[model samples]
Target chain A: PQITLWQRPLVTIKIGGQLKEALLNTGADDTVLEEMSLPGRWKPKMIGGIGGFIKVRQYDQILIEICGHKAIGTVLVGPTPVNIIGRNLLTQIGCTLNF
Target chain B: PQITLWQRPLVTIKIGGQLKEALLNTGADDTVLEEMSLPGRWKPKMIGGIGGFIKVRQYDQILIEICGHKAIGTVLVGPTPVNIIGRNLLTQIGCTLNF
Candidate 1:
């Protein structure tokens, strides 16, 4: 079955473990963790991505389900002070904005 | 004595407490609160407006006089924080947003 996910204007997502949502920006290459509450018990590791040119810290993996589509990936976990949604995960899940 | 404060569109307010009418933005909902511009003694309180609720620390008292009128209000003191005028306060002073 094909899962179709619609881009919500301002969707709520679960950060670390808390349910929250961030605006999807497909232009960004990385997923920015901002204003999120993290849970302990998660050990972060610094692994390389595709080119290994840009090194980022991945504390835990997050499951983001937008509209009806879901995708699992790692996010740089920390005390995200600002509220911004990057583009990386958006492309993986394929989100469409109707408004 | 009569005091007139013409609610500004988007005013820059001190996080701790300092300055005049959070220098009017006249556009965005969030305001900007830069550093220094603040003093001591005054207890820092979390300020909330149209944008939402924010946890602030201290403040310095500053005199703010509105344009074509008289406006005075103390804001939270801290690093220049971005602010968005809350709709609640907008409605309190009667603001019309032709959208």
Candidate 2:
């Protein structure tokens, strides 16, 4: 499906059997969730954006379904103002910037 | 030109006579710069994202060249961890999310 760019390209996503809304962020490297409890061992990492760097729990090999397209990639959980679906998962679903 | 979604789809942007690199952020509503004293009067505004909201000076009708494509739109100046080119300007260049 072709996703049109909006003020914010937000989409519905399913992860860890939970439905949520996430911003389709081509700027971010990896997907970030506000806060989620996944049954897995995660490593601590830092992600920086328009404000500053924040600590995150990096969990690899997570399943994410974005707008009906499913992808398996790394997911970061931390204190985020909004959930972001980044290029790591976007590319898996063949997402690209078409001009 | 077609832009491949990297871990972060970053591109070179020319704004305010300065050449800078900015992330192509579909999640963000408007382009936000770390700090640029742009000419003309601007209104104070707020933008929120993963992490929280930040106060920004909104300048409209600014010229921005992204990946050699010229676009005139709104530009927000504030303290940002990284510069981002958002949907407001991306749509001007016909950027879309193709999967």
Best by the TM-score measure: 2
lDDT assessment of candidate 1: 0.39
> Which candidate number would show the highest DockQ if scored against the true structure?
2
Error of 1 at B14 (Å): 40
lDDT of 2 by residue, B24-45 (tens): 8888888899887688999999
Model 1 chain B — which ten-residue stretch has the worst lDDT? B1-10
**Which candidate tops lDDT?**
2
Task: Report the lDDT tens digits of candidate 1 across residue range A1-99.
Answer: 221122223456655446665544222234555535555445554422111222234544577665445766656643333233444455455432221
In model 1, what lDDT does residue A78 have?
Answer: 39
The local distance difference test score of each candidate is: 0.39, 0.85
* Share of the reference A-B contacts seen in candidate 2: 0.72
lDDT of candidate 2 over A79-99, digit per residue (tens): 988899888898898888553
